[PDB]
């Protein structure tokens with residue numbers, strides 16, 4: 022009812038595995054037509070296969086969120102074949118933090134500004150930003166993780182204010198320690214130490230991030246905007 | 260009858276359920292299949308709750324509960340246990356006044372939460388959800404009261420979530436902004452227009468729109484969300 | 499023939515609770531060093547006598563008294579005594595928090611004590627149209643889960659409390675601020691095994707424990723006239739380790 | 743005492759910047775204040791002279807790698823390394839915030855070599871004074887996280903990095919504000935008044951002192967009790 026996304030087109034970047042894949046499946050399951058992206062032709066073909074195997078109408082595409090040209094072209098392709106995406110989920114050393122965060126926010130900003138025209142026309146939108154998963158070792162890692170998270174929060178809160186009068190919401194999801202291919206390959210010691218800091222005593226599932234995204238994308242979340250919802254089993258960092 | 264991904268057969272306790280946000284929450288949990296026990300402080304309010312639930316096809320009851328009283332809490336829970344089973348979803352709903360107000364709210368949450376925890380601990384499953392106050396008065400006293408309550412609620416929610424997390428019980432809160440309620444309808448027209456201008460969405464929130472967030476947090480999909488305060492405020496953030 | 503100090507708090511009376519050791523003692527010495535007349539408190543006669551001796555040994559004019567911040571009577575009586583003998587305390591540092599399902603009762607008890615003491619001292623500050631109330635948060639003392647829960651709860655309650663009281667009293671030129679210590683060096687943490695120490699320090703960008711004096715300096719500043727537009731703030735003093 | 747220390751304060755020709763330069767001077771620092779025009783830099787030199795403060799006034803464009811490097815070199819030749827650096831000079835929310843942080847990062851990275859050598863430093867970032875609310879909150883969030891991160895990167899070198907978040911301060915921008923906006927602002931400030939530029943400077947002076955050595959990664963709000971989310 023509120024939870025139906027029937028008749029909506031959703032763009033989910035970095036959808037070939039993990040949290041991205043799970044998000045694309047959840048939006049599909051809720052009735053959306055889903056366009057998942059990857060950076061390689063191989064990843065984009067994998068996305069198309071996964072969507073087919075789950076009954077989800079849509080497609081898999083190649084997108085480089087760092088490139089104005091790729092963005093504009095990808096959106097054009099979506100417009101030609103399926104219509105305007107009105108749900109967009111952005112998923113995709115210690116001197117590094119400043120350049121990393123800056124690059125992420127430019128990518129969000131590029132993609133968000135591009136998809137906004139269609140949302141502005143429609144007078145309806147959902148932009149949802151996925152923060153980074155926990156598990157990078159040492160002080161350099163924690164520095165990079167906290168910087169990214171602070172930049173994402175403020176970015177999300179600001180963009181929400183800019184576009185709010187158009188009935189477009191902008192929210193973010195801050196994952197904690199989630200069971201993914203990248204975290205499975207973490208050394209066992211780092212993992213056990215992470216696990217011990219989580220009140221729920223387990224890793225989160227990728228589906229458990231996707232469910233939050235699915236809700237935020239629904240009509241029932243229409244008065245939620247500028248928010249960063251943490252999904253972390255009770256483990257909070259400053 | 261055996262449920263899957265639904266609130267069916269779960270018993271939910273929603274306090275202050277006679278009107279506004281509380282009522283809407285009770286209806287949403289009912290709609291999602293829960294057996295719902297709504298509470299009020301008066302016999303009259305509790306009867307109103309029972310009627311409203313009946314009129315909407317929701318199985319459950321309306322009861323009298325004084326969350327300031329250890330006796331009333333224990334007695335109310337016993338009655339629920341006898342008739343319907345242990346409530347595994349619990350929604351707590353309800354410038355020099357701020358200290359007493361916040362203090363009283365948190366003692367009431369703590370009392371009720373501690374009481375319902377034994378049943379959740381046995382079941383190895385639970386959902387406690389705390390509703391913050393609505394943005395309800397325009398002056399300085401109001402904004403002070405609202406920010407104090409909200410800060411106390413956030414930290415309380417985060418702490419309890421840590422205490423009970425290992426038992427697969429989640430504890431979250433919902434921080435409403437400016438919601439269309441009897442309290443806010445009676446605000447002067449001049450204050451309303453000035454309110455709306457501080458809200459990016461340009462409108463009041465509906466009580467249903469708080470209830471939908473609560474319904475989601477109560478679901479299985481929200482199992483990895485705990486200690487969180489979800490703001491539902493149309494983009495107006497105020498501390 | 500009377501000696502007039504040129505220090506920032508000359509001619510002010512300061513009340514510092516829980517002043518018998520650690521951060522409290524250091525705060526009392528700093529305010530004294532900055533020229534304040536200083537009344538340090540403890541819960542026992544022996545602690546109050548220790549305070550008086552320490553103050554005397556450091557050239558600080560003032561006293562050591564017994565105060566139980568959990569008791570309305572003790573608070574009122576202690577204030578009256580201070581008024582009679584030395585004058586109204588217009589700088590008040592609340593240090594004396596407790597410790598030891600426990601988090602809720604601890605935090606609640608602290609905030610009632612702050613509120614009691616703050617309300618009592620406010621009459622003198624309201625008359626004077628000037629005040630400084632400064633609340634000291636708890637030291638990082640437990641690295642598990644129960645400890646981190648207690649520490650974050652206390653800190654959140656203190657922050658909102660501080661911010662709210664600041665609003666209530668602001669129009670009277672009284673400021674209300676808090677100081678949130680991180681890992682501060684004490685006799686108990688020096689005796690931690692060398693292995694646990696190195697692992698702790700690796701969480702702190704500065705790579706060292708804070709000194710009690712380093713909390714006291716921040717308190718001394720917030721107490722000054724230059725800090726008059728700082729109110730409702732919680733200043734973290736933690737060497738860059740932020741945890742919540 | 744900041745006796746024997748060299749301080750670089752950008753945007754020092756008026757307001758908060760000027761007051762910061764005078765406070766650091768008063769505390770004994772040799773002070774280099776910057777402005778974007780020759781005229782502003784000359785004004786700074788005059789103001790410093792008139793107050794007994796040793797130092798200089800220079801032209802600096804924090805958006806330019808060349809100007810930064812050259813300015814530092816000039817300071818090094820004549821006075822020695824600045825070990826206290828106050829970034830005051832800042833300037834569609836997205837482009838503004840991004841530009842500020844690049845400037846902070848540029849200037850901070852440049853001054854860090856001298857601080858790393860000395861094994862001592864103080865970097866202090868001044869936030870913006872109170873569409874507008876969006877810009878202000880974005881800037882403040884970016885500043886906080888920036889300040890907290892840089893503090894972690896440089897902490898082991900006994901360099902602290904902190905920020906000051908002003909509220910409604912009596913300055914050129916705010917003097918021109920309409921009476922209606924002012925009165926509405928005052929009513930949201932518990933202290934019931936504007937802050938003085940000196941009152942920001944005093945916080946900066948303290949953060950620059952040895953007694954603030956265990957404070958790092960902090961943003962100290964100086965706003966009379968008015969807080970915005």
Ligand SMILES: c1cc2c(cc1Nc1ccc3nnnn3n1)CCC2
Nearest residue numbers: 122123172175176839880884887888
């Ligand atoms: C642009 C816009 C907005 C923000 C940040 C940027 N740019 C950067 C760049 C680096 C960085 N490090 N930590 N944060 N941060 N932020 C946050 C509020 C909106």
Ligand SMILES: c1cc2c(cc1Nc1ccc3nnnn3n1)CCC2
Nearest residue numbers: 361362407411415605606655658659
């Ligand atoms: C009173 C006033 C205010 C606050 C808290 C209380 N009382 C309690 C009591 C318990 C508790 N646990 N976590 N927080 N918390 N707070 C914070 C905002 C102002």
